[PDB]
Every structure is written in structure tokens, then in C-alpha cells.
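In the previous chapter we treated chains in isolation. Here, by contrast, the input contains four separate entities that must be folded as one system, with a combined length of 647 residues.
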Amino acid sequence: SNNVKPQVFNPDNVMMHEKKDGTLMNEFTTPILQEVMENSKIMQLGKYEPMEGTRAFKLGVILPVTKEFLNYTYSQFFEEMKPMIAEAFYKKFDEAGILNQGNNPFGKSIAQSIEKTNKVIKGDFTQDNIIDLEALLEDDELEANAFISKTQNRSLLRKIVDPETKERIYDRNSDSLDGLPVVNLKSSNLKRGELITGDFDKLIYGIPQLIEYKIDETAQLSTVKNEDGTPVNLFEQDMVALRATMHVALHIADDKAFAKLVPA
Amino acid sequence: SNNVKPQVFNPDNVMMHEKKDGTLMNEFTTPILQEVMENSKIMQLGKYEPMEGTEKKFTFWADKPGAYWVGEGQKIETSKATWVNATMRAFKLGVILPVTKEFLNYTYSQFFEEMKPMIAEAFYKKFDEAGILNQGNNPFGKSIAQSIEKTNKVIKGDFTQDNIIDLEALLEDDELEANAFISKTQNRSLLRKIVDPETKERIYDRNSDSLDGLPVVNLKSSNLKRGELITGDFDKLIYGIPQLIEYKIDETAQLSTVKNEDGTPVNLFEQDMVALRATMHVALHIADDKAFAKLVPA
Amino acid sequence: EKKFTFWADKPGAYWVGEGQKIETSKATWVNATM
Amino acid sequence: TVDLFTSHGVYRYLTNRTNGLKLTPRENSFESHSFERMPITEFSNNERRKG
């Protein structure tokens, strides 16, 4: 529109060419990847299950962009944002399935399995506590397959050495503990001193609908209010939006297959 | 919010893959169509008329010259011709079916493909009941029942050879000849027991569905009562179709005759829904209000 | 055992003025078993 | 007047636009021919049949 102050949106999720202070991102240099992509950990550890139809639940998001931004500031925005959305979905799914966090829709999670079976070790990281953690699984004829850890505790793992072989139990190059691979979770909910392990083949997942993307220049975003409170009309307000959706399903076949180590 | 329960709609016109009790509808057994889809009885009996725009004009002769006997050398007198005009306009039918895309993926892949004949049936019935019986908010200021009402061309009494011949005679009383009968299938019971007492000929062919040798057409409508029968010179009933049924399927419009649980209009894009629109243009014209007559039980 | 599903409600249809809102309607089906 | 040519014969009908082009059979409604394929041949000016 002829508005010389930029449009304030509520919530402020719309991408804009002009900042609130009047700065204009003309000739704007494309951002660069300061971090690597975080793959889904339950899609890495767990067992895939061929599934037809839906239990499943639907993930989704919408990204609105001001077409000024899409023309002058960053033309390829939607092509470079697609994988970042996929990462957001993987993180939401991992956080729901593992930690029972983020308003998970399933009634199932590893955190709930552990809280039910009380398979928790109070203690600092020591070779004896690692062996006890593993024995909590082998007690029930199940053998540990991998470890889940907050990367910030490698400082603790390097301090553990086998007093028989007199060598590090943790291979800091392989990132494997006692010969088992350790995967790192970037989420803020798993605390520094916490470690999880289990036979992840007992954790089953399915994906009835792979991540689908649709770009639209016409819809109305009921959820995004103009400053006056009217809903955003993409066509009249010269705006564009990307919709992404996915269906994921999670199942835990045996909830005693998981154990957790936590600080005393 | 992260509210994962399924969306309630008002009116409950939206097809859904998940029920509010938590039942999830996989393995759906696709329903089989019991009946046969009905044709438009107006398109069957009436006269088609090409119509390019939403309106059409007709012009006919009305007055013809006279003649005179004149003596030798007498002045030959004048005479005059005259014409009259008539016109007809079209109206638009339509309906929209909204569908949740989960439903369209995991429950009924063909649903929109299976609805198209049921829509064509509902449209043809809407047209027939408007033009024939003046029912269903008839948009045209024209109809058979309305022409009969304005002419008072109604016979009262029971189905008899007497009354049915009187009914047909009521048309040649206006120099028109009957061409067909419109009746309610409930009443072929009555027609299948009226017999000419001289010849012992039955007025009705149970075999050919002919009444006094004219063809009979049955209405499925519930408005035409058992005891009622209609006849006319249907060549005087003109219809046109400027736009045959157009379907379109849209994934991003806003509906407004349907509201979310919170009262917000349904947005197909933001809510991940799809909707099927069907429309048709149809036009109706009674060329001569006197060309129709009706028999009614007293 | 055998099971059947049949169409039970036909969608309706509406007369719509020039530029007016087209209203919606739904089909429904019914289950039987014999 | 309508002639319909098939691989075994000609069917002949009458129609009018008024009744909706309902094809009505006609005097000598069918007439056999001794070819074994439809007799009419079409030539095209080019792939698109444009003048």
C-alpha cells in the first residue's frame, strides 16, 4: 500500500524488506550457514514401519513473506528455507517422541516409558554407572543399541577410563561410548548431566505423508492480524506464503527397553 | 495451542477422516449407488432453444391482411400486418462440497469423482420441480402449474375415460392438441383399471406406459400428489442451457456459509481443505400459457 | 458374514443470484450387514 | 438430415435442433456397402489442421 511506515503484523512473523527503523535491505547479501543441519534422531535410531493411511498426527507451518522482500531483499528465500523447515519438523518430532515435550500429541514417548518402568540411575558419569545403566537393559534380556546425549557432556565422558585396559572408554573421535554410538541432541530440554540408552529397534515410527510444500499468493491468513486487527489478505496486501505439512506416527513396542542416567 | 483434536464445523457439511470421538476411518468400504440417476423431465419433454447470452428474444406474426370484393374501376382498399414479441432469461444453479484433504487421501480417493453424477441429478431435479410444479423457489416468473393456475384450466374428479378425454378436449378447445402426459408413478395403479365399456379397450397400456396412445412421463417429485395428472402441448414449452454443468475444484478460496467452531470463516488454504464447486445455467419459457391443463382429485 | 455401504443422503442444490454466495451441502452413506 | 458411416454400412436419420437432435430413423434407415472400413477419408493441411 501507500503506507510509508511499514505494516506492523501480529504476530510479527511476516518477512519484510523494510525494518521498523526504516532501513531498507536493498542489494542484501545472502545469509550463510553458520551451523550444520540437525537430522531427526528417532528417524536415525528407530525402526521404520511401512504404513498405509493413518496412529498418525499432522505437523505443519506457514511462512508469510512480503513480496517486496521476495523481489528486492532475497529472491531465492523460499528455495533456501524449505530445508530449514524440514529441520524444524525433525526437531519437533524428536522432542515429542524422546522427551515428551512440546505438547506431543501421542500418548507414547520414551520419557513416559522410563518414568513408568522407573529405569533410572542416580549418579555421576563413571564406568561403573555406565555399566549399571547398560545392565538395566540386559537384566530383561534386551541389549543396548546406542546412546542419546547432550553434546555438552563430552567433557565428562573424556574423564572415564577403564582401569583394567587403562584406556578411555569414550572414543572422542568416533563419538562412541563403550563401543556404542552416541547421538547428540541439540534441544535445550535434555540437561547437561543426563544420558539415555535403549534398544531403539523397539521404537517404531511411520510417515504416511512425506513433507509436502505449497506456495500460495491468494489465501487469507486468519491467524495473522494487521495492526488494525483485520486478517491478512495475501492478494490485496501483495503478499506470499509457503505452507508445509507432514504426517508422522510413533509407536513404542516394548516400554522396558529404555533406561536413563541422571545426576544425583 | 497445539490443539490436535479435529475441527468441528457448522453446518456439519465437511467430510472428515477423523471423528470427534477419536475413531480413525481407515479401510473405508466405498458405498455403492443403489438407484439409477434421474434425467430432467423438462429436457425430455420440452423443446430445446439455442441461447448464447443470458437472454433470448422471440418474434412472431400476429395479424394478417384482409381482402375485399371490388367492382370494376372501384378503389382497392388497404389492409395491415402485425407482429408480437416474447423473451426469456436464464438463471444459475449451484452447490459447493467441502472436503478435508486427509479425507481425500486416506478415506475416499474418488469422492469428488463419485459426486459429479449425484450433483447432476440434484440439478436436474431442481430444474424440473421449478419449471413443472413451481416448487423450490422457482426463479422464473413462468411455470406449468402457474400457467394452469392463471388459465383455470383444471378438471376436478376421478381418473376415468370420461375425465381424461375431457382433459385432452380442454386443449383443442383452444385449437391445440395434447402431446404427452405427466403423472406420479403412484397412480399407474389407478390408470391400470379404467376400461372403455363399449370396446373393452383399456385406455392405458400397462406394457408401453402409453395413456390413450400418448406417452406418459413419471415425476419422482413428492409435490405431485397421487390423484393429479398433467397434460399439454409440450412443444410450447421452450428451454435453454447457456452453460452446461461446470465443475471446478479449489484449494485456496474462503468459504463463508460454513463456520469454524470459533465462528471464523473456513479458509481452505490455511486449514488444509479442498472444495468442489458445481454450477449450471438454465432458462425456461412457456410459449403459450393456454397449452397446459390439469386433472385434480375433487 | 457380509457387509454393505449405501448412499443415503444425496447432496442438495441451490438457486444462486448474480454474484451471490453459493451454499454448501453434503452426501451421506449408511452401513448394513447380513 | 444425418448420414452416419460405419465400417459396414450407412445409417440414415432425421433430426432437428428444436427437439435436441434426437436421431430418428428414416426411410430405408440402413444401407450396406461393400468396403471393410469406414469410407470417408480426411486430409490435413499440416499436423495442426490449420489453414
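The first strand of chain C starts at residue 3 and ends at 9. Chains C and D do not touch (no CB pair under 8 Å). Compare these points with the single-chain example from earlier in the chapter.
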